[PDB]
Design a protein around this ligand. Structure first.
Ligand SMILES: Cc1cnc(Nc2cc(N3CCN(C)CC3)cc(S(C)(=O)=O)c2)nc1Nc1cccc(CO)c1
Length: 289
């Protein structure tokens, strides 16, 4: 008789998504994120998932490993991977999108009390990330996903880096696509990323939330009005100059001064003088009481 291999008992990994059942619906945003239906039964009843893939393979693999081990109410859920060298990150899908799409469409529903509750949830997610010794480096309203009218989640970890044990910051090398208008002075000047640098980005995200992500009131729009919109390659040094002078984004319309003061504590020039996420949580909780 012909010799063959004994078949070992097959086990199913719920985090392993087969390419043949992962069916594309549409692009969500750009590296790119797509809405897919994982449909192993082929009858359009499968679960909708968000799929992150490459248009850098090493960076995607590191991102997958970070997200796989993060478990928090305000952090988007990892679901698994789809493997070819190629890899796709599979996450839960949030149909409301980010604060960038949701806030302009739901102003009537989202009052100051709800905005402060979203602010608390962003801080809780960020404080959990910091407790795991990570710096996010991309905290912006476009990366805050809306689970429901009552809950937001940090939804992308593409620039997330680990801070070495007993060290205070991570030094960046690849910075060409940096979101400079959300960056603290130490990031712009020395490419040094502290947990306090994410606190700075939070202050900017809080400004966006309070303006309902209005494009005319965006941090880029406002800073470009303050420094000049036609400076090209000179834009960042003009931005650094402005921040050194003590100039900050103005108080959002209808934002009470006590909320604006918490926001300004995120924007102290020196990282050591900035508020912590825990102190922000306490400040917002005192305003909600
Ligand atoms: C992990 C995840 C789960 N669920 C969603 N949902 C979702 C997202 C969006 N985008 C949010 C970011 N915007 C700049 C572009 C639109 C839109 C919809 S919708 C309203 O069209 O159904 C849904 N997106 C995810 N990630 C994702 C998608 C796109 C871009 C980024 C990076 O900012 C992260």
């Amino acid at each position: 008789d012909i010799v063959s291999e004994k078949k070992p008992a097959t086990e199913v990994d719920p985090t392993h998504f087969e390419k043949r059942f992962l069916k594309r619906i549409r692009d969500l945003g750009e590296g790119k994120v797509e809405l897919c239906r994982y449909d192993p039964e082929g009858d359009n009843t499968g679960e909708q998932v968000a799929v992150k893939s490459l248009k850098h393979i090493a960076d995607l693999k590191k991102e997958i490993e970070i997200l796989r081990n993060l478990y928090h109410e305000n952090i988007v859920k990892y679901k698994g991977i789809c493997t070819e060298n190629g890899i796709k990150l599979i996450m839960e899908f949030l149909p409301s999108g980010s604060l960038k799409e949701y806030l302009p469409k739901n102003k009537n529903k989202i009052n100051l009390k709800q905005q402060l509750k979203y602010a608390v949830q962003i801080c809780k997610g960020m404080d959990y990330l910091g407790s795991r010794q990570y710096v996010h480096r991309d905290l912006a309203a476009r990366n805050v996903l809306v689970e429901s009218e009552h809950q937001v989640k940090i939804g992308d970890f593409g620039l997330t880096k680990a801070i070495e044990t007993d060290k205070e910051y991570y030094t960046v090398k690849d910075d060409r696509d940096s979101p400079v208008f959300w960056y603290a002075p130490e990031c712009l000047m020395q490419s040094k990323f502290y947990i306090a640098s994410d606190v700075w980005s939070f202050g900017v995200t809080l400004h966006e939330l309070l303006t309902y992500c209005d494009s005319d009131s965006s941090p880029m729009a406002l800073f470009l009005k303050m420094i000049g919109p036609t400076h090209g390659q000179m834009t960042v040094t003009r931005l650094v100059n402005t921040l050194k002078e003590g100039k900050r984004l103005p108080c959002p319309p209808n934002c009470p001064d006590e909320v604006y003061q918490l926001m300004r504590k995120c924007w102290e020039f020196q990282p050591s003088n900035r508020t912590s996420f825990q102190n922000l949580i306490e400040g917002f909780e005192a305003l909600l009481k």
